Write a protein that holds these residues in place. Structure first.
Motif, PDB file in Angstrom:
ATOM      1  N   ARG A   1      27.936  45.349  38.055  1.00 33.89           N
ATOM      2  CA  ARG A   1      27.302  44.202  38.685  1.00 33.89           C
ATOM      3  C   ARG A   1      28.059  43.835  39.948  1.00 33.89           C
ATOM      4  O   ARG A   1      27.469  43.595  41.012  1.00 33.89           O
TER       5      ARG A   1
ATOM      6  N   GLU B   1      26.556  43.478  43.632  1.00 31.35           N
ATOM      7  CA  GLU B   1      26.590  42.177  44.308  1.00 31.35           C
ATOM      8  C   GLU B   1      27.405  42.162  45.604  1.00 31.35           C
ATOM      9  O   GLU B   1      27.290  41.219  46.377  1.00 31.35           O
ATOM     10  N   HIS B   2      28.223  43.187  45.845  1.00 33.75           N
ATOM     11  CA  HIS B   2      29.061  43.235  47.050  1.00 33.75           C
ATOM     12  C   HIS B   2      28.449  44.127  48.117  1.00 33.75           C
ATOM     13  O   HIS B   2      29.040  44.362  49.174  1.00 33.75           O
TER      14      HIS B   2
ATOM     15  N   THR C   1      30.774  33.548  33.218  1.00 32.82           N
ATOM     16  CA  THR C   1      30.843  34.766  32.443  1.00 32.82           C
ATOM     17  C   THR C   1      32.215  34.933  31.813  1.00 32.82           C
ATOM     18  O   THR C   1      32.326  35.417  30.690  1.00 32.82           O
ATOM     19  N   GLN C   2      33.238  34.487  32.534  1.00 26.22           N
ATOM     20  CA  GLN C   2      34.605  34.635  32.093  1.00 26.22           C
ATOM     21  C   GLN C   2      34.951  33.630  30.987  1.00 26.22           C
ATOM     22  O   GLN C   2      35.784  33.904  30.108  1.00 26.22           O
TER      23      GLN C   2
ATOM     24  N   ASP D   1      21.356  32.927  46.122  1.00 26.64           N
ATOM     25  CA  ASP D   1      22.304  33.921  46.594  1.00 26.64           C
ATOM     26  C   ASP D   1      23.258  33.235  47.578  1.00 26.64           C
ATOM     27  O   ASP D   1      22.802  32.648  48.550  1.00 26.64           O
TER      28      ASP D   1
ATOM     29  N   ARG E   1      25.267  34.329  49.778  1.00 28.60           N
ATOM     30  CA  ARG E   1      25.222  34.906  51.111  1.00 28.60           C
ATOM     31  C   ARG E   1      24.079  34.360  51.982  1.00 28.60           C
ATOM     32  O   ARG E   1      24.127  34.493  53.200  1.00 28.60           O
TER      33      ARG E   1
ATOM     34  N   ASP F   1      33.755  36.162  41.850  1.00 27.11           N
ATOM     35  CA  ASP F   1      33.043  37.175  42.638  1.00 27.11           C
ATOM     36  C   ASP F   1      31.679  37.561  42.068  1.00 27.11           C
ATOM     37  O   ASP F   1      31.401  38.736  41.793  1.00 27.11           O
ATOM     38  N   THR F   2      30.851  36.542  41.876  1.00 27.03           N
ATOM     39  CA  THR F   2      29.425  36.721  41.714  1.00 27.03           C
ATOM     40  C   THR F   2      28.789  36.155  42.959  1.00 27.03           C
ATOM     41  O   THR F   2      29.415  35.393  43.692  1.00 27.03           O
ATOM     42  N   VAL F   3      27.551  36.537  43.214  1.00 26.87           N
ATOM     43  CA  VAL F   3      26.843  36.019  44.367  1.00 26.87           C
ATOM     44  C   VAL F   3      25.915  34.890  43.908  1.00 26.87           C
ATOM     45  O   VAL F   3      25.285  34.220  44.724  1.00 26.87           O
ATOM     46  N   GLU F   4      25.853  34.680  42.594  1.00 24.43           N
ATOM     47  CA  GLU F   4      24.952  33.704  42.002  1.00 24.43           C
ATOM     48  C   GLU F   4      25.507  32.302  42.168  1.00 24.43           C
ATOM     49  O   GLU F   4      26.666  32.055  41.874  1.00 24.43           O
TER      50      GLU F   4
END
Ligand SMILES: Cc1cc2nc3c(=O)[nH]c(=O)nc-3n(C[C@H](O)[C@H](O)[C@H](O)COP(=O)(O)OP(=O)(O)OC[C@H]3O[C@@H](n4cnc5c(N)ncnc54)[C@H](O)[C@@H]3O)c2cc1C
Ligand SMILES: Cc1cc2nc3c(=O)[nH]c(=O)nc-3n(C[C@H](O)[C@H](O)[C@H](O)COP(=O)(O)OP(=O)(O)OC[C@H]3O[C@@H](n4cnc5c(N)ncnc54)[C@H](O)[C@@H]3O)c2cc1C
Lengths: 611, 611
Positions: A105, A109-110, B98-99, B203, B205, B291-294
């Motif tokens: 993932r 995502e990067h 998630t973590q 997102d 970004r 480091d998710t884009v969500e």
């Protein structure tokens, strides 16, 4: 202005697809039902194995993720078939299921070119036989130039535990997709149904570590990725071997007529049925993570009733007190007949629509990933209007797979293990980069520092083979070595280096013993890859030439693609069992025609003195 | 031999439950539909806030995980209400969704007493009004001494985006549970339906980081867990503030009559409806991981049609080019009326059956977790035959919550934020351990090294307050300090330490300025905790005594549980309304009776000259 490629499903095919489209510099939209679950490993907590290892390295060599992902996430690394030859050496590692998925993932995502969407696709729309858009659950149409479908086992999925069955796409925990299959049939697609099984998971702590024999990863393991440098520290958990008892088999015979995997290969039911003479069967207990308690019971894929499964497991030595977290089950799903797609991963019924993964009735992560990679590359190529890529059966295991897929049509999902690809030495895992790296470059997936680096590693091998003939070795240095090894005694003037290192001597046994050789070539010393390649190229001179000659014979055959709209009732001295197989199967290439069991070697010769 | 406690659902309630049962030394079985999803944060990517911070620390103080989990997994730590007092200080951190989930699984899996099973419960069986077993999908009965139900929003769940609705328990990505609710109604349980909303994810970004104002975690953050030592390094991501435009509100008014959250508080629809005078509303953009884009769009909970949502979001400054990964939606679910359960978390209709979490029509992770903890503790106590634990409204926010739950009956899920618990200073976040640590011990959740350590920290505070009346400070040291602070000028002999540090001076401002004081007490220095407690105990002397005096009236009236078996018909000078609210609500304690809005202060006085 819209999207270029929209990739449905973010499993193993989907990822390699979306990553290839993006790294190929095109705007990409990854649509998937659950982002918590990208690249989830539904079954085996491992990557690689017999054919799977080679095909993983080939994915790496072309610039795919699966190679890097397992090096990044491995738990125990183990090369299979160690005593056998370079052609038999097969890389395989246990993955941290959850950590593998997270890595995949992270990478997706990067990548700037990939936009993400969490929705389910219930339809694909198309105008006059070419792809246009895709309908999501809300009933929106999302417009794109080309679309890869990578839906795995989700299309009208059904979970089978014994006699009862629940909706569910991967596990019971996932809703199945319902709209899309009818929508595709509507566009002129035939579809069947396949069943595949997964074994039950057990609590590690319930295992008797007094009886079960431990199997650690091997000292000095092998990285899948050519970019990786070590995986030495990635030996974090070991696996656990056991076998089944005659008494296990009795317990399981009970449920045979209930289990919808029992047939007449994917079962423990099927295994005991087809082989009632073996009074034992291997099972591998594999941890699913470095600190999970969940454990996969390899070689026990089953659809027997929930209550019979535990009764069976407890009979296996070491598992008398096994606590079962999940039952083993079978997943029944919709798949699209592989003749409907081209070798290029594009579909016949509709242009710009590509199919990749389990949806083509194949099984395996590596198998699916390899298709996704190709489907991805070719989606970029089509939009650009460039040449589409088809790999040859002499080029890659991926080439063999994709060819065999569209060709060999059978009621069971295609696995690479039973695939005994006679092209072995030329396709070994350890030269995958040399073979495919340039192809990777053309698709913007391999860097110049990479491509040019593989172009130079081949230069050194042959440059070294120049010296391996000239170089001379006096009987003064090797005779005491050969005395102890009990090998060939050097009575005389044997130099011709190559003529030495063949029967059981290392290339490094020579550089160490003669001043002559290291003076002419100490470059192989400094580089361990060249040393490995050279040592095989000469120790397998005979067999490589023999294999390559047939591969060229088969290359020439697969290179006559013109047999189509011509009278099969023109050919002179054919048939009687040939000709009828030719009209039935209707072979695209004459190489494909020579693999049909009906046609003879003498028949294809009369098809060649023709085309 | 069977199981003791089986906990259904491994969400926030379920975990704290299963962990409490296990750490309490009993064999426990956690049954949940999906292990990939334990303690998943379905909504907010954060823990804590106004009432939620206090209740988290109180969970920690009692020996729960939620405190440790957020210290382990925080992304930005931020204390709310900094300028306000100790009673208003509210700890809150962003979680890596998630973590966080991964951590919580890891802990549950490392507890030996918990066995795990992945299945769905479709029924609970009971013999003559006491719990016996639980029916899983297969139709097995699993036998246990006592069972905690913690099902969250899964019981006949329904997802609402505008006008269309799909099955789904948490998200569309989850199957809803169907058997159980009818099976419980079968055992004499009434049930209703609630709706709660979640905002859309975008997102990162696609955000304009030129307009949006960045909000970093505060320098020197505060750990939730009393066991944690630092969270300094856990400031990894920051959040992003924006507000909505008059133009945003116009776009949203379109879908009001479609959205099944619009009412006549849980909406952006509801917010603009109830407050059309404010021409702006706050929105917080929160990354869901390092480091998710969500990205979570706080303050934009919505049920508007999918197409109207994006149209709204893009009107918000900074989000003109926002790419929406998911739409916001509402989840409709079955809940069981909180009067049917006791204060002890045990149910009236059936003994040994406990209800914890969203199933009691509350909302919040912390709110659910706190119930799970208590439900867990009390399940152990029941099996042991020990005293069940009920927390008082002067003891904990958890006590207030659980009391208010079973008492205050309203059509909306109970949130602690609007809960303006008048008991503020005595229940502040920073003394939670002192208040609850001993109660933790009795339930085998707090170690002796922990319990005894909190028993000694209270000794030092009062031991220090002995010296704070005695110690002296000359006008030589503080006069230059007070000149700059512009405070009280020390013309003369002011020592009486306490008499100094009151109007706006730190306890540490004194220790630093006089040799006299640190010589008499440098213990508070070493325990920066003692220093913090003492400084408040004296700066808030007046208000603490005032609050504690009222709490003691509510203390006495809490434990008047005697009026069990008598009619409200035999009571003289009471009603009008007053008697009708008593027969309707049927109050357990006479303290509980004085909080019913129907009964008067004069009515409860006639209930006292009685019991
Ligand atoms: C008997 C058996 C043996 C096996 N042996 C091996 C082995 O030896 N080695 C090995 O590596 N593997 C093995 N597996 C294979 C493995 O189980 C599958 O091949 C794999 O799960 C499929 O990969 P995929 O990428 O094609 O699809 P999946 O990974 O299953 O991807 C499906 C994804 O797409 C999404 N999706 C699907 N449909 C839609 C839709 N319509 N709209 C939006 N999103 C959608 C879902 O969210 C999901 O994540 C074995 C399996 C079986 C059953
Ligand atoms: C408008 C709104 C605002 C919110 N604001 C906040 C906030 O400010 N702060 C905050 O912290 N939270 C907030 N949330 C609250 C949060 O969404 C929920 O409270 C939470 O998801 C419920 O917690 P739970 O432990 O009770 O159940 P869940 O966490 O939802 O647990 C359900 C679990 O139980 C299992 N399960 C369920 N049924 C069964 C079954 N029958 N058999 C087997 N397994 C089962 C499932 O696998 C699942 O993991 C908000 C939510 C909404 C909708």
């Amino acid at each position: 202005h819209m999207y270029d490629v929209i990739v449905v499903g973010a499993g193993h095919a989907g990822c390699e697809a979306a990553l290839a489209v993006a790294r190929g510099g095109l705007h990409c939209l990854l649509i998937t039902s659950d982002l918590s679950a990208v690249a989830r490993m539904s079954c085996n907590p491992a990557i690689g194995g017999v054919a799977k290892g080679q095909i993983t390295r080939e994915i790496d060599a072309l610039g795919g993720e699966m190679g890097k992902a397992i090096d990044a996430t491995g738990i125990q690394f183990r090369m299979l078939n160690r005593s056998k030859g370079p052609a038999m050496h097969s890389p395989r590692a246990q993955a941290d299921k959850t950590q593998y998925s997270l890595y995949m993932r992270r990478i997706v995502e990067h990548e700037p070119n990939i936009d993400l969407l969490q929705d389910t696709v219930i339809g694909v729309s198309a105008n006059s036989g070419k792809f246009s858009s895709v309908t999501v659950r809300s009933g929106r149409a999302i417009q794109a130039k080309a679309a890869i479908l990578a839906c795995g086992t989700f299309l009208n999925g059904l979970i089978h535990i014994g006699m009862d069955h629940f909706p569910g796409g991967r596990s019971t925990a996932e809703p199945p997709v319902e709209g899309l299959t009818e929508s595709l049939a509507s566009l002129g697609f035939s579809f069947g149904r396949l069943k595949t099984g997964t074994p039950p998971r057990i609590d590690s702590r319930s295992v008797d570590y007094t009886i079960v024999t431990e199997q650690p990863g091997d000292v000095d393991p092998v990285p899948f990725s050519f970019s990786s440098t070590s995986v030495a520290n990635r030996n974090l958990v070991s696996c656990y071997l056991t076998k089944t008892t005659e008494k296990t088999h009795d317990i399981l015979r009970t449920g045979f007529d209930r289990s919808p995997l029992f047939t007449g290969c994917p079962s423990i039911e099927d295994k005991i049925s087809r082989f009632p003479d073996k009074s034992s069967h291997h099972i591998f207990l594999e941890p699913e993570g470095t600190d999970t308690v969940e454990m996969y019971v390899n070689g026990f894929s089953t659809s027997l009733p929930e209550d019979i499964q535990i009764a069976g497991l407890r009979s296996i030595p070491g598992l008398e007190e096994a606590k079962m977290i999940r039952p083993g089950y079978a997943i029944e799903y919709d798949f699209f007949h592989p003749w409907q797609i081209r070798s290029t991963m594009e579909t016949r019924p509709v242009e710009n629509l590509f199919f990749a993964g389990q949806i083509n009735g194949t099984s395996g992560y590596e198998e699916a990933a390899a298709q996704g990679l190709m489907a991805g590359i070719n989606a970029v190529r089509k939009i650009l209007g460039k040449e589409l890529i088809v790999l040859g059966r002499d080029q890659a295991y991926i080439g063999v797979l994709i060819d065999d897929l569209i060709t060999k049509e059978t009621k069971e999902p295609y696995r690479m293990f039973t695939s005994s690809a006679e092209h072995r030495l030329i396709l070994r895992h350890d030269n995958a980069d040399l073979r495919l790296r340039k192809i990777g470059y053309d698709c913007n997936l391999v860097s110049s520092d990479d491509l040019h680096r593989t172009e130079s590693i081949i230069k050194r091998v042959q440059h070294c083979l120049e010296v391996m003939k000239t170089a001379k070795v006096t009987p003064a240095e090797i005779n005491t070595l050969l005395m102890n090894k009990g090998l060939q005694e050097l009575k005389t003037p044997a130099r011709a280096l190559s003529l030495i290192k063949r029967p059981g001597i290392s290339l490094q046994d020579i550089l160490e013993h003669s001043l002559s050789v290291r003076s002419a070539a100490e470059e192989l010393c400094n580089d361990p890859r060249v040393a490995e390649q050279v040592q095989i190229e000469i120790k397998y001179e005979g067999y490589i030439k023999r294999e390559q000659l047939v591969a060229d014979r088969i290359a020439r055959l697969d290179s006559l693609h013109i047999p189509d709209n011509f009278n099969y009732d023109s050919l002179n001295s054919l048939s009687s069992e040939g000709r009828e197989k030719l009209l039935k199967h209707r072979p695209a290439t004459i190489g494909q025609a020579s693999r049909i069991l009906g046609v003879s070697p003498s028949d294809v010769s009369i098809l060649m003195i023709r085309l």
